[PDB]
Design a binder for this molecule. Structure first.
Ligand SMILES: Nc1nc2[nH]cnc2c(=O)[nH]1
Ligand SMILES: Nc1nc2[nH]cnc2c(=O)[nH]1
Lengths: 159, 160
């Protein structure tokens, strides 16, 4: 664990004051939790996307994501470039191993450099923040946050 | 005024507003709050609004959160404080609600206003007054929202 790679990782952590605060409020959102408690009804996805789009106006991130527990399964949603994308989280051993590794930890949040699951040729530093509320299976009810490219992270280093 | 004596003081308040400012901005511009205002502030959904604010207050460690919403030309003031959801109508200019007209008449996205409280006048706070980007028909922001900070919370946020 060389000193220069601790400093880079530590320096990035200290830089993201606003993205971390919003990721925590999104993961713990009462509005999002209501939607999850209702069974993730498709009819309200436009409201969820508009809620996330409002947050992205405040932030300077490439994407916002929600990973919600429903009936024992994980449902992954993402707002990116105005499009609301969704898919089901896959079993362990597949491209969604980020979700099981984070939720198995005791960390309230983590910064994860990973390839994207909708566009694998893209990569981001994801702010994975867990909700305080857990589902019946022990997984967090909601894992949510932002995806940051290098340009946005470089602007946070300056500030 | 007198800078050098307040310069040590001034740095201390900025550490007070790193998280409280970000959440105040997201609350004022909240799509969830906006929908409620667009629906006419129906009383049936106040429990949802109060539960929504309770999540935010757990994150920030602040004494109070407030919402000042425009509806049919009048301002409606709501506050969550110590688990209680308080509400009243904003009064005309020249009264104790001059903070609202002075702020909304300005061009500032937000302001810090040291003022006595309108529900409990014996209390005072530094209020983070943040305006929504969307405006009502009268030109005032659809929503002004934010947190009220005591000295104790600011003194702790000072050390950090
Ligand atoms: N690939 C990937 N997608 C995510 N979406 C949210 N967090 C992550 C993550 O850590 N990795
Ligand atoms: N008295 C008072 N109450 C507020 N509630 C929200 N902002 C303010 C303010 O500036 N003054």
């Amino acid at each position: 664990l060389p000193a220069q790679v601790k400093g880079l990782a530590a320096h990035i952590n200290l830089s993201l004051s606003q993205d971390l605060a919003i990721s925590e409020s999104l993961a713990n959102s009462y509005f999002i939790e209501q939607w999850v408690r209702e069974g993730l009804p498709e009819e309200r996805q436009n409201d969820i996307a508009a809620y996330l789009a409002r947050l992205m106006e405040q932030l300077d991130t490439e994407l916002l994501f929600i990973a919600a527990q429903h009936q024992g399964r994980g449902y992954y949603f993402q707002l990116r470039n105005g499009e609301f994308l969704q898919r089901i989280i896959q079993p362990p051993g597949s491209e969604d191993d980020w979700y099981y590794h984070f939720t198995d930890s005791d960390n309230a949040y983590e910064l994860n450099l990973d390839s994207d699951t909708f566009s694998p040729d893209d990569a981001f530093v994801y702010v994975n923040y867990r909700s305080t509320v857990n589902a019946a299976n022990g997984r967090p009810l909601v894992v949510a946050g932002a995806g940051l490219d290098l340009s946005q992270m470089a602007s946070l280093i300056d500030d």
